[PDB]
Paper text:
Initiation of macroautophagy/autophagy is mediated by the ULK1 (unc-51 like autophagy activating kinase 1) protein kinase complex and the autophagy-specific class III phosphatidylinositol 3-kinase complex I (PtdIns3K-C1). The latter contains PIK3C3/VPS34, PIK3R4/VPS15, BECN1/Beclin 1 and ATG14 and phosphorylates phosphatidylinositol to generate phosphatidylinositol 3-phosphate (PtdIns3P). Here, we show that PIK3C3, BECN1 and ATG14 contain functional LIR motifs and interact with the Atg8-family proteins with a preference for GABARAP and GABARAPL1. Two hydrophobic pockets, HP1 and HP2, in the Ubl domain of Atg8 ensure binding of the side chains of the φ and η residues of the core LIR.
Three serine residues S90, S93 and S96, just preceding the LIR motif of BECN1, have previously been identified as sites of phosphorylation. AMPK (5ʹ-AMP-activated protein kinase) activates pro-autophagy complexes (containing ATG14) by phosphorylating BECN1 at S93, S96 preceding the LIR. To provide a molecular basis for the binding of these LIR motifs to Atg8-family proteins, we determined the crystal structure of the WT LIR motifs of PIK3C3, BECN1, and ATG14, as well as the phosphomimetic S249E for PIK3C3, and S96E for BECN1 LIR motifs. If that did not work we made a chimeric protein consisting of GABARAP N-terminally fused to the LIR sequence with a Gly-Ser linker. The determination of the crystal structures of GABARAP chimeras containing phosphomimetic LIR mutations S249E in PIK3C3 and S96E in BECN1 provided us with valuable information to explain the increased binding observed upon phosphorylation. The S96E BECN1 LIR bound GABARAP similarly to the WT LIR. However, E96 formed an additional water bridged hydrogen bond with K46 (GABARAP), which could explain the increased affinity of the phosphorylated LIR. Phosphomimetic mutations of BECN1 at S93 and S96 increased the binding affinity 3-fold for GABARAP and GABARAPL1, 8-fold for LC3C and 5-fold for LC3A. Using phosphomimetic mutants of known phosphorylation sites preceding the BECN1 and PIK3C3 LIRs we revealed a marked increased affinity for binding of BECN1 to GABARAP, GABARAPL1 and LC3C with a striking increase in affinity of the phosphomimetic mutations at S244 and S249 for PIK3C3 of up to 19-fold. This implies that the LIR motifs of BECN1 and PIK3C3 might be regulated by phosphorylation.
Residue numbers in the entry:
A (entry chain A), B (entry chain A), C (entry chain A): -14 to 112
The structure:
Amino acid sequence: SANEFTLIGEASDGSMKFVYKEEHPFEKRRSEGEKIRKKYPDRVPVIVEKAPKARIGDLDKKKYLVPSDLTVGQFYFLIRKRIHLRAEDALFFFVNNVIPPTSATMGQLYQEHHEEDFFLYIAYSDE
Amino acid sequence: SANEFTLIGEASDGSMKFVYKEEHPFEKRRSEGEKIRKKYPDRVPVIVEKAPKARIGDLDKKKYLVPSDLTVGQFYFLIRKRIHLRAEDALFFFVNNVIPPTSATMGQLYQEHHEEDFFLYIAYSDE
Amino acid sequence: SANEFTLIGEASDGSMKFVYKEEHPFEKRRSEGEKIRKKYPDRVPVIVEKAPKARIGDLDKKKYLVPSDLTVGQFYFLIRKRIHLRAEDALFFFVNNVIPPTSATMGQLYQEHHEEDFFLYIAYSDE
């Protein structure tokens, strides 16, 4: 197909703003994250939000406390069941605009990417 | 959701006991694993068992001889077809209580994790 | 199952020949790949072909221009939708006969594996 290409996929705009951070002042989030990490050191606190452009279902709950040794892939299935995804619908997680390996553990992601309020922030989208 | 978290996922209990090892004495397993590795050096012998708590189907066969360059992900699909998983059901593999990368090859997992009887042991579960 | 193994999976024959290369002389491919990489440096040109033995659907288009920061896993879903895979059908990508990690980016694969005509070649199969 001479000079012909099919342009597919979109470069991430990196513009994911979490509503959680707009609705809860930093000092309140940090106090809470610090406390929950002290109380439950084998668990990590995670905020999960849908990317605004995503056309899949929203979550009822956004604050999760998950085992540090749980993988991304296990978390994927737990979240997918909560939004009732059509069988053929894709679901991707983004941490700081990057999709993590599905065998990474939630503790590993948290250690590397948690924010200064001691939460790990994950966005999800359908593309 | 003030002080509110949804607790999801379970920390692995690491208590996976393989029935294969309870039914076949170590020396018989080792003799067999040694022999099959000598005869078929480009293949690895694998014991696959369902985690007792898993509510998905059991396998008819547990002893597999697989190409060393086959990936975990290819193996996943071969095993999934054998238990007739509902489309939305999850399937996870565990080697020594850890989920391997799906692009790892069976030979790589075997080299790192085979037991002293020269078998690689994989447990599977739905969570 | 004494002396009994179930032999499953197939060792890759590494014999994937791309029709694209048989139909377009090297110098024409290189000129084009060089030009498109100069013009669109944040995108990578990819040739996608079905492995001849695969019993899944063929693609209408084989020449794609994809964002460098798109993952393999995102690309998987874009290609899967284009061939209308039955829900339970597997789809695997091979670059130089090896399945890449699904979290690798297309730019990372391109940097490591592009050919001298400046295209990245991906084969897909159902096993």
